[PDB]
């Protein structure tokens, strides 16, 4: 996260770290959606242009964390993966359309002050809150600038951007399964996700029921925090029928 701040303890209790077993390293962010299910970006698990195609046994998830690098004894919980599910129409070839994946844990994780699931949006909350200018919140342990790494989880609040502005910022083909967020060059404030934040959540706090909803997944950007560029996020509500189908079946 570029131009963010340190998270408060328990601020993002749904945040998950995707962790490579060997070598031991941060791969991506992720989020806890129930005691057995974790949501992330498909490209965190499958990206053939970079020879990336992880299997369940390659990975762990670390839940309840605050520190990036330290083993948070008696606080974090480390879970093995039973199964990965990638959206069947995830487009790794072109533009990361439908950049979403689910991971089922081998055993349920115990909730605590530090570990608690986020809500997935219903149609009405999504329609009400996914509006240009409305801000969400992005969290992660990724790099602090494009060109270094944080001691603890970082947080930044960023406004959703009008779709024509998103499209006009890039040569990449933008789809209805994406939205973009960030400040404009003339807005003064700044901030973005960066490398290592992918897969983590873009959340909004509903003013109707005071619950946090995950509206987006950190998906892609051209650099980090560049003027005139924006971060692109997977539109979770648009893909929720797939999420529900996977959870219902498996």
């Amino acid at each position: 996260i570029v131009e963010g701040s340190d998270a408060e303890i328990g601020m993002s209790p749904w945040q998950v770290m995707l962790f490579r077993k060997s070598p031991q390293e941060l791969l991506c962010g992720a989020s806890l959606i129930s005691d057995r299910w974790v949501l992330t970006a498909a490209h965190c698990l499958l990206y053939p242009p970079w020879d990336k195609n992880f299997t369940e046994n390659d990975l762990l998830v670390r839940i309840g964390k605050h520190s990036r690098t330290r083993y948070e004894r008696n606080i974090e919980k480390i879970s093995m993966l039973e199964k990965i599910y990638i959206h069947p129409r995830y487009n790794w070839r072109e533009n990361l359309d439908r950049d979403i994946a689910l991971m089922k844990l081998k055993k349920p994780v115990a909730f605590s002050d530090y570990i608690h699931p986020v809500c997935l949006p219903d149609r009405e909350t999504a329609a009400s809150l996914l509006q240009a200018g409305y801000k969400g919140r992005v969290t992660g342990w990724g790099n602090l600038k494009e060109t270094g790494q944080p001691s603890v989880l970082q947080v930044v609040n960023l406004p959703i951007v009008e779709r024509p502005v998103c499209k006009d910022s890039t040569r990449i083909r933008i789809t209805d399964n994406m939205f973009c967020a960030g400040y404009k060059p003339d807005e003064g404030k700044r901030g973005d996700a960066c490398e290592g934040d992918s897969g983590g959540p873009f959340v909004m706090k509903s003013p109707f029921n005071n619950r946090w909803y995950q509206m987006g997944i950190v998906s892609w950007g051209e650099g980090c925090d560049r003027d005139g560029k924006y971060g692109f996020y997977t539109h979770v509500f648009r893909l929720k029928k797939w999420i529900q189908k996977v959870i219902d079946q498996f």
């Binding site: 601020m11 209790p13 986020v118 997935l120 809150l129 409305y134 609040n157 406004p159 946090w212």
Partner: peptide, 28 residues
């Protein structure tokens, strides 16, 4: 889940985090 999106150290205790008000103020 039924209890989703309510943080033990914040909403469950009626404590606000340092920047959630910035989000609320944008929901105009």
């Amino acid at each position: 889940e039924a209890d989703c999106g309510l943080r033990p150290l914040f909403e469950k205790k009626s404590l606000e985090d340092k920047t959630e008000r910035e989000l609320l103020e944008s929901y105009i």
